[PDB]
Amino acid sequence: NQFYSVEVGDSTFTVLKRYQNLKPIGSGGIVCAAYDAVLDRNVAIKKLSRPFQNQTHAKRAYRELVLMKCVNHKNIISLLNVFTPQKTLEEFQDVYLVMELMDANLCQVIQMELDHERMSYLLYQMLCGIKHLHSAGIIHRDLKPSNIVVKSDCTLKILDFGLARTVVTRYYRAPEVILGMGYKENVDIWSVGCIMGEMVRHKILFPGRDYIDQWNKVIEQLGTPCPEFMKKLQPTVRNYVENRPKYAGLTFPKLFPDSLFPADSEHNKLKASQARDLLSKMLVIDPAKRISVDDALQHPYINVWYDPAREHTIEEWKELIYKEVMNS
Numbered sequence: 001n002q003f004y005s006v007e008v009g010d011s012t013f014t015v016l017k018r019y020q021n022l023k024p025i026g027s028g029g030i031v032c033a034a035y036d037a038v039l040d041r042n043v044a045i046k047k048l049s050r051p052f053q054n055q056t057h058a059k060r061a062y063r064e065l066v067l068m069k070c071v072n073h074k075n076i077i078s079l080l081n082v083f084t085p086q087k088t089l090e091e092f093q094d095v096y097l098v099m100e101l102m103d104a105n106l107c108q109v110i111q112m113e114l115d116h117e118r119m120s121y122l123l124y125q126m127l128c129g130i131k132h133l134h135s136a137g138i139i140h141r142d143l144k145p146s147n148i149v150v151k152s153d154c155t156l157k158i159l160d161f162g163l164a165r166t167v168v169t170r171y172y173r174a175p176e177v178i179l180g181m182g183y184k185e186n187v188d189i190w191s192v193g194c195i196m197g198e199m200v201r202h203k204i205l206f207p208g209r210d211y212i213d214q215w216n217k218v219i220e221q222l223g224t225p226c227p228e229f230m231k232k233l234q235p236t237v238r239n240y241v242e243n244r245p246k247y248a249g250l251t252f253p254k255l256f257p258d259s260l261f262p263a264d265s266e267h268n269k270l271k272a273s274q275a276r277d278l279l280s281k282m283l284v285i286d287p288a289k290r291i292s293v294d295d296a297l298q299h300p301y302i303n304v305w306y307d308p309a310r311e312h313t314i315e316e317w318k319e320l321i322y323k324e325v326m327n328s
């Protein structure tokens with residue numbers, strides 16, 4: 001065989017022989033770290049089991065495999081390999097995706113104290129990869145720290161492409177997503193802001209069981225929004241939103257007090273006021289008054305790094321995915 005099988009928990013990994021010493025990693029698809037004998041480096045390998053098995057898993061796999069092909073930027077995932085060990089379409093079950101092994105995801109980086117050089121630099125790279133997607137027509141709309149990974153040198157990559165045009169973690173989705181609104185590119189600034197605020201506060205900013213709950217955590221930290229905002233709502237969401245129990249909401253100093261920041265030197269004191277300025281501009285309900293990607297990249301906190309630089313059947317999904325895999 002070109003391949004070999006190995007038990008890793010309950011699933012079997014069956015992979016190119018070039019992949020050795022599989023170790024289960026991260027939160028799960030099952031992903032294993034492995035040594036690539038051929039490239040002589042470490043990789044992470046994800047097993048998709050029968051991705052074509054329902055229209056949801058299938059649309060997203062298909063979509064993400066087509067989009068990876070396209071895209072090419074250091075802040076955005078690239079596959080080193082895509083393979084299946086099954087030899088025919090009729091036999092086809094599993095797709096394996098191989099990428100460079102990184103050091104940690106951003107959920108773990110969040111738990112740490114980070115200085116301003118590292119926090120601005122992570123945020124800078126997130127904004128570079130978002131610019132890049134938007135350049136290729138992709139508006140992510142579901143950025144979240146579990147899909148973002150980091151190296152020890154603080155280099156960052158975003159690993160997914162978000163929603164299409166059609167327990168899942170909803171805490172980082174923009175009001176325009178939460179509310180059915182219509183959106184533009186700066187929808188993803190709102191997710192950068194949730195992430196930025198949780199690196200500062202070390203706790204999820206807008207939690208809840210459902211969107212109801214999430215909305216309430218939002219308006220009561222930030223205040224009920226207003227007029228121009230509402231009329232871009234559909235009358236029935238406008239109705240639930242307009243008859244919501246009201247908040248004045250907190251200013252950003254109360255929301256993000258100094259005690260959270262490095263504040264020992266004059267450099268740090270300044271950096272902390274810059275950081276709060278950015279937060280204040282990213283975590284803005286109405287996307288009309290929310291900062292864009294370009295302007296965020298020009299923000300003084302950020303710019304120190306600046307560098308110019310259909311519906312298918314199962315059977316139908318399987319052939320499409322199979323073909324992307326084989327490239328045919």
Ligand SMILES: CNc1nccc(-c2cccnc2Oc2c(C)cc(Nc3nc4ccccc4[nH]3)c3ccccc23)n1
Nearest residue numbers: 025026027031044046061064097101102103104146147159
């Ligand atoms: C600790 N170091 C480290 N290094 C690299 C990866 C991970 C990691 C750990 C546990 C869970 N997932 C992880 O990574 C991934 C994520 C989060 C998302 C992806 N996106 C994706 N794109 C798909 C397209 C179709 C189907 C599934 C997909 N899954 C990955 C694709 C490939 C390989 C890893 C991915 N961890």
